[model samples]
Target: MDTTVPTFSLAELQQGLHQDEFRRCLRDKGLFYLTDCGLTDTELKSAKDLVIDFFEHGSEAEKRAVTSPVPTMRRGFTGLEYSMCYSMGTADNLFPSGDFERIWTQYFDRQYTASRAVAREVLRATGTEPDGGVEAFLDCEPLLRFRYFPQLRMAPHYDLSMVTLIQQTPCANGFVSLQAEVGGAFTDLPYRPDAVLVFCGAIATLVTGGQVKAPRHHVAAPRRDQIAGSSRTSSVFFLRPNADFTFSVPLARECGFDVSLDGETATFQDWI
Candidate 1:
């Protein structure tokens, strides 16, 4: 299996995704790394530190207080055994009477804007527009995830969202691995703190009629000696389309993928 993935600068990415070479790379690889996408060193460090503090040091009762009863709700601190996710919609105050909320909101806005730009580029590349442009398809509720490696080994699977943007603190034994396609062998994703890794997800696959692949990926566990007692940290944003929005592949019939839509349609919620 090929191990190398393509990396692009923010300027190059913003130029639009209609270019022949760029589109082919994205279609074939299903992953892209963006450099200078606007998150700075100080910002990344602060966010990582806050996540660790919330997961490792925050009171158990307090963390549990925000936990969602439904697993799929994915609203709040999920504790250390699984993973902790703070939803942009539901998390009122992650930290007690502090600026944590403000800081995270600003960070979230920047990340969301960057990710949305990518979504728009994808739409342009595919030559399709549903209604309200990309925003109409986007979910009003997005999520920020902090995954602890000790309790992590996400089974290799395609993401349900439209796009996933991620950054991770370097760890000795743990790293992300991605497969070229379903049932393909997994290879380590090239890691770099300066770049944000973006993975296309199932929605993109459906929209493009399989022209773009949804990268199958998983988090590998750290070695006992490598981590000792500490856990590695990974921060991510999973971007999804609105649950009620109808999703239809404009190029499905021409692209030659199996298209059962047949002039019918399915909502994002129903498809997922």
Candidate 2:
């Protein structure tokens, strides 16, 4: 058994390589590093710079000006991060400026494209696709999120989405840590500059009929030997089951999750 995290390249995956390796990784780890994802190094750096600029340049008054009344609404900037809805719905968007919106939107567009391609391969790896046009809603609301870790920490939890595509921008002193319960123990995921990290979410377990399950994960705070005025930054794209995609409730319950339902099929909304 391979004890190390696997790296899957989009070009290679598309070119018919590592087919069984991908499925095996998902079955056991539920996460892996994605390479050759079409985003260039310059683009990745610029996107990270966007996150840095958002915090460094703006004052409390400047950034808070667009803060959503209800942070959970995922409207504008809220909680420990700022989220931009990739869904073109009437979700309120409050950016620092017109230029800010344009740059972030560009990042969203490119990363979402790569994320969608990954999802397609993931679905295909599952041996079959869902029938309720589940493919259409696999990753609809890609909430483009930016997080700057100062003194705060993200508690352990599971993503309700299908998968979370993450780019942990360069941070010094081993402070930018993302850990998950891999192989029955919590371990830090390597910070790769050339790839995106894909993690399974709740929807993944539901869709895979217990074959794949979401890993319990969280972000670790900076180590004792931290850099001066440094903070962890990341680009997180959440791929959700936005539509009422149905799945087997029995399977969800059988996976040892708290599924308070009794039926053959359950809507995504109901399962959540």
Candidate 3:
């Protein structure tokens, strides 16, 4: 048996993705295990520090009861609370903008550069007109979470934006379970600290037959033994369409997915 794991080059990642096999993996498996995605150690460290400091030293406040976009998670371990910050343009109120700006700009540029490279490759393979290419989408200030996963389990939820991109910084252990349908059993994608994983909100919804299940996924419970001596850190960047951009599904259904109601799907432009 071959012990070596397959890794993806930028071009190959994009090209491989356009094929039916990859799309089926995403639709049926609900996740892709991408290894050696080409992010460097130094870059990951710098980004990790910035995020840790921002959460530790920056302002920490309970979300406003009426306007908070972050919902209270009553069913979790006692340590961490849900993040109140949400994507832009949604009705949810964001963390005070001034404080976010102090920390946001420093980490995003580097992360965006890497993410755009991946997105560009994806665009080329899909043969879709690259709308604004990658630059336009990467510029937005997306939210970051600085949390301690003392316990390995993360609550299951679907993201409400066009894409959710997660990058693991430093080192972490655990896996994310992506299910094709709500109540479906999960398929696991283990964490590779250097790699980033992205999934489209629209594609996820379509795969699950218009149910929110396409995006339903959960993280593994934290390793208690690793908690005291080591910890895990991650930063997630959401590539969202601009507020003014209109929402519409791609005309071509290359994957033969079921698109039930055109008007019912939430407009990408309207997401936070």
Candidate 4:
């Protein structure tokens, strides 16, 4: 069947998580889909336009950068390097735009709220809070792009610093692959726009016993179809640590006791 949007009702999504297939995929692949967590076509389109405007119309330095080995459109003001991607943080250091605060609050905050709620639920399903919204820490501006075709695919590399929370748009021929650190064996799964996928850099490493590596994926070429074209936009929030606040893992020494990590254990960086 042609999947414009990965079809799955809330109930079905919930059920899928419980199934062994879903559990295996998430644990082994470091990625999984919920299949339909309530998003509409109009909302997706609006998000796309907003992103395009942010990159093209909102800023001056925001221009296409052909830094990737493959020739593709990448626009962002921040120079901070992510796993392999780039991003702008809340510190105003990377993104010099004086209006970044206003732009993020107006256009991106809503999606962050929704994605956070979903991340919370996913943690609850795992019988604990998985890193306490670590994915939304820095509140960074994202580097957005569009591939006109499916000819480019990102290389495989683990993201040890930031978590990737993706909400795919209605498109075809884009998929992320997960590989085993022990052996080179891997699996590829299509990007499902209907659901949100979250991955914690540390949590994934812990679960994999350093065996599952979070590698990179790419698009073969630019897409052309209006609906499934390469004109895709992905919003990546840095979720940075507060400059004044220190950060550390929240694991307990004892089962019930809480671990406290103030500035002594960890220090926040100027950039995300």
Please name the candidate that would achieve the greatest TM-score relative to the true structure: 2
Write the candidate numbers in order of decreasing TM-score: 2, 1, 3, 4
Residue-wise lDDT of candidate 3 within 1-272, one digit each (tens)?
21122335455665564365444444443334344455555665654464345444544353232123434532111232322222222223233345553434445554555555654544433454434644565454344443443224566665644456666533343334232222255444445646666655543343233322134566554355544433554556655545544334442133333335455334444443
Please give the clash total of every predicted structure, in order.
0, 0, 7, 29
Please give the distance, in angstroms, between residue 271's alpha carbon in candidate 4 and its true position after superposition: 12
- TM-score of each candidate structure, all chains considered together: 0.79, 0.85, 0.55, 0.49
Superior candidate under lDDT, 2 versus 4: 2
lDDT rank order = 2, 1, 3, 4
How would you encode candidate 1's per-residue C-alpha lDDT over 102-172 as one tens digit per residue? 67777887787777777666666767575666566653456677565443455676676667888766645
Runs in model 2 deviating more than 4 A are 59-61, 79-91, 150-155, 223-230
TM-score of 1: 0.79
The collision pairs in model 2 are: none
Our model 1 lands, by Cα RMSD against the true structure, at: 4.1
lDDT for predicted candidate 1 compared with the true structure: 0.65
What TM-score would you give candidate 3 relative to the actual structure? Answer: 0.55
lDDT of 4 by residue, 79-188 (tens): 22211233333232223234543544443454545444444443434444223344444333333222211215566544433235555453343433222231244443
lDDT, model 1, position 47: 69
lDDT of 3: 0.44
lDDT of 2 by residue, 98-124 (tens): 877777677778877887788777777
For all the candidates, what are their Cα RMSDs to the real structure?
Answer: 4.1, 3.4, 7.6, 9.4
